[PDB]
Design a protein around this ligand. Sequence first.
Ligand SMILES: [Ca+2]
Ligand SMILES: [Ca+2]
Ligand SMILES: [Ca+2]
Lengths: 70, 118, 159
Amino acid sequence: QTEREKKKKILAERRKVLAIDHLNEDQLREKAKELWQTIYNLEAEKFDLQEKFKQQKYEINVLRNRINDN
Amino acid sequence: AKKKSKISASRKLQLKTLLLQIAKQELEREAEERRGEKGRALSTRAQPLELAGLGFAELQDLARQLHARVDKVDEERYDIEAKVTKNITEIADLTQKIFDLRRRVRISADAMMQALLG
Amino acid sequence: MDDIYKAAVEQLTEEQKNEFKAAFDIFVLGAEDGSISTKELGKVMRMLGQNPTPEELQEMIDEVDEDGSGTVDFDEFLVMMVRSMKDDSKSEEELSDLFRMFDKNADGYIDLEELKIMLQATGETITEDDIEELMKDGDKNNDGRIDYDEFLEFMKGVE
Ligand SMILES: [Ca+2]
Ligand SMILES: [Ca+2]
Ligand SMILES: [Ca+2]
């Protein structure tokens, strides 16, 4: 790996180590919960963004006709 | 026959008014499904946790994964937001094109009646 | 010859038609034609705090003159009253969302097909008349479909 890539890898591992490693088995479980939730919420914004994307596709399409037929 | 004359004006509007009400009704039947659709999708894309019997090593593994998944899921989310943003801009443009492509003296309803009648 | 106001008049109660007549009958008092000339409309307008020119006035008559009389009769007056009558408030945005509920196939055109299914979805026992009719008004191009713009023009002023 390029020195630039190992550095990306390491610093990414270091983020894991800085956030997780000092926790005990109890703070650990709570961290897992926190991360889980964050994912869930991010995953929820994604689904709303996906649904809106489809609607915009139809709106863009209707605007296509409207511009055709004129 | 004008063959536009077939039924009354009271009828035309009789239905048009109904059309819209099952459309609005269908509009929220959809929004309603969209909800369960979301919960169901979340339940799959973000399965709830089961920390019950995990040891320290396994637990620590999980947190690391989940820590990795927050980066991942967030990028995915960004990429879809970008496509959506772009779309707001492309929509603004198209609309500005259709828009570009394709004082008064009027009587008052309640005002008049109050004037004429006692 | 289909207007959103023609249906307005038709649905006027006998209690309504009766009061509008006394209003009309007082309105044309003094008129020889027994109808609303600019002379009459300017009087009432002035009671409403406005002094239109003879032009703008006659212009308001035309807005509803159907016989080239240059005046207003009771039936013409009834129309005039429902036009100014509704405090109707729907947005092109609301209708745009409804449009999409008609386009079952998502082509961006409410067609003859979807119209019937749609018109059918509503509890009303629909006849080939209502169908033949509804599509006629909406079909400004009659190109077998009903596009966005004319769908707006279509539902314009609908409850
Ligand atoms: Ca007349
Ligand atoms: Ca269609
Ligand atoms: Ca059409």
